[model samples]
Target: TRPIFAIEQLSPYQNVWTIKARVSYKGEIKTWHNQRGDGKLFNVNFLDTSGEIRATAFNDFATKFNEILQEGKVYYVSKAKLQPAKPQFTNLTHPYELNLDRDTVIEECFDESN
Candidate 1:
């Protein structure tokens, strides 16, 4: 079975991982229009047993991310890119943050522990 990692273990150097965590905060969709096109984005804070980290979704995937990740729901998330945290955009203490893209997978966890 694949191991579920704690949020504290996330880093910009790693790409393959899964985290079983609960959403601590979910931000509202923010839309923007530039010369290239128009799109939307949102942020979510996830907390696990070890620590907390932030995740962001952009463009056409933002709405789907905001819809599936509830404020207090637990989920097993995978296939996202981890990057160095942007201090100006995040208040989280985590050193890294994740960005969800077209290949991201997020599934709700309904186990007894949740």
Candidate 2:
């Protein structure tokens, strides 16, 4: 289903959701290598009629998604995990964000009406 849940209110309590939003911005790609090993990730800023939030993808997801999630493109995304904003890890303005993991579902929204 597309736009299954209204993205007006997003929180950690909401386990699943779907939305059609446009990529408003993309942050610089960053890599972290620590005792835990190496990781690559990037943050995408999305906006819909309701508003916007930050969605991040890491490692495999990051690389795969980076190409599909380009700026100013609308996409229908689902099966993403939501969590409270981590102030320490990000300075994102949104109170919540989505985790684009391996199982996350995404498709380009080609319908111009959306």
Candidate 3:
């Protein structure tokens, strides 16, 4: 397992890793419909000792994350895939992709102030 720091720390890896982080922000719920029917996508900001990253949960994950995740909460995340981020799309300190996956696990932060 690796600790998440600047965005540069994230890249395509051959094996899965487990990371711990805190939820910094939870985006508002938005809906979308297409041939696949209706669904939703929202962004969640996670921060560790190193830095923060944005994770997007689509459809049911959005609903689940909304119910379970809250700002200032810590979580154990895994099984995420990384891809390059468009500079115009993000304002994070590092240059790279953010983790995007549904297998992420969120937990409450007991002492987030640290």
Candidate 4:
């Protein structure tokens, strides 16, 4: 219902938004057994007409996001948290990173004909 954003223009100054993107890549899922406990997570790269971005999901969010993914699918994504990217762990060149939470919404963009 609102304007979609280009990844290059995303900023913490505005905490929430909607974006239209296609899944350009999906990284492997990893499960970690640590001092805290065991958990699952994964990363994915998305490309919109303007640019691309990387998104991460951890713990239960990982399970949820995993269920949403499909190769080359276009999506209308919203309501995620944005944080400063940790360069040591990220391959993405973008300055910020995103992670999905319970409130996040990721809906596949459907063809009107379908």
Error in Å for residue 5 of model 2: 1.5
Off by over 4 Å in 2: 1-3, 11-14, 86-94, 111-114
- Candidate-wise lDDT, in order: 0.70, 0.69, 0.59, 0.70
Q: lDDT: which is higher, 3 or 4? A: 4
How would you order the candidates by lDDT, starting with the best? 1, 4, 2, 3
State the local distance difference test value for candidate 3.
0.59
Model 1: clashing residue pairs?
Answer: none
- Total colliding residue pairs, candidate 1: 0
RMSD of every prediction: 3.5, 3.7, 4.6, 3.4
lDDT of 2 by residue, 1-114 (tens): 335555665545555677777877777667768687898767777777766567887777877777766677777777777766655666654444777765777777655663
The TM-scores, one per candidate, come to: 0.75, 0.74, 0.63, 0.73
lDDT-wise, the better of 1 and 3 is 1
User: Cα deviation of 46 in candidate 3 (Å)?
Assistant: 1.8
State the weakest 10-residue window (summed lDDT) of model 1: 87-96
lDDT of 3 by residue, 6-107 (tens): 444666663244556676766666766868777776666666666556766677776765567567666665556665566667676542334444565554
* CA lDDT, candidate 1, residue 18: 79
The superposed Cα distance between candidate 1 and the true structure at residue 10, in angstroms, equals: 1.5
